[PDB]
Homo-oligomer: A and B are copies of this chain.
Amino acid sequence: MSERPSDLVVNRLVLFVVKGTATSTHNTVKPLILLEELGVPHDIYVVEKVSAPWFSEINPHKMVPAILDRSPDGRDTLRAWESTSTLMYIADAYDKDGTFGGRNVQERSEINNWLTLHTAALGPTAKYWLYFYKLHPEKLPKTIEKLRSNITVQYDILERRLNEPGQQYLALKDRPTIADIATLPFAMKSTAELFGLEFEKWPKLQEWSVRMGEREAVKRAWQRVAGFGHGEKEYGMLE
């Protein structure tokens, strides 16, 4: 059994993050964007060690983002982990008019298609590219090349979708959804440059990334996620 830190209390949604760095924020920013869009009251908890027993009992995958929140009746606690799952949870609990989660079966059908495309395809492909490029002890260039090639195929799919008449966002024509929030961090100029790709080659995808990036909630989320653990408090429950 594991013991939690004394400052870990769940009086509202608690979003678990690590110290902001270039390589630590592309997943944690996703739930933070949706919390900012919906004005959900939330705490930020900066995790010193994701290998800590107490944290593994929240997220067995031992990564951020993770969420602890009160159950709707406030009697119990529940958890969300995997960035896509944190988006699903926040939409379920707090998006009660379906603005970001989808208002009907038809809207949700397209939202889940484009959300799952990111969760299963671009997300893991980008993660494996990053691993084999930086993290793996040995350099495997033929593997890195194939993964880079797969990223361009995913960008091609997103570009095709955003070239469809009146298709301003990935899932819905009219407004951004959790599908757009999930995709943005892996389909923007800075991330494309990291992969060694010229993002200008996908012009509608670039225009979409700029339109998403101009949203106040998105600007706020990016600013905050970079700063977590670099304020008055380094680790634990932020004030």
A residues apposed to B, CB below 8 Å = 60-61, 71-72, 76, 78-82, 84-85, 88-89, 92-93, 104-106, 108-110, 112-113, 115-117, 119-121, 123-125, 128, 132, 136, 138, 140, 142-143, 146, 157, 160-161
When the two chains form their complex, are residues B113 and A82 in contact, meaning their CB atoms are under 8 A apart?
yes
User: A80 — which chain B residues lie within 8 A by C-beta?
Assistant: 109, 112-113
Main SS at interface, chain A: helix
Q: Which chain B residues border A71 with CB–CB below 8 Å?
A: 105-106
In Å, the complex CA distance between A104 and B72 comes to 9
Contacts of A123 in B (CB 8 A): 120
Look across to chain B and name the residue whose beta carbon is closest to the beta carbon of A160.
B60
Q: Please give the count of copies of this chain that the complex contains.
A: 2
Q: What 8 A-B pairs have minimum CB-CB distances, sorted nearest first?
A: A124-B124, A82-B116, A85-B116, A88-B112, A78-B109, A143-B143, A85-B112, A119-B119
Residues of B contacting A117 in the complex (Cβ-Cβ under 8 angstroms): 61, 82, 85
Q: Are B113 and A81 in contact (CB under 8 A)?
A: yes
Whole-angstrom distance between the alpha carbons of A76 and B106 in the complex?
Answer: 9
Find chain B residues with CB under 8 A from A104 CB.
Answer: 72
Contact across chains for A61 and B136 when beta carbons are under 8 A apart: no
Is A105's CB under 8 angstroms from B72's CB? Answer: yes
> Do B79 and A105 touch across chains, with their CB atoms under 8 A apart?
no
State in angstroms the CA–CA spacing of A25 and B156 once bound together.
26
List, sorted by A's number, 8 A–B pairs whose CB atoms are closer than 8 Å. Answer: A60-B160, A80-B112, A82-B112, A89-B105, A92-B108, A124-B128, A138-B142, A142-B143
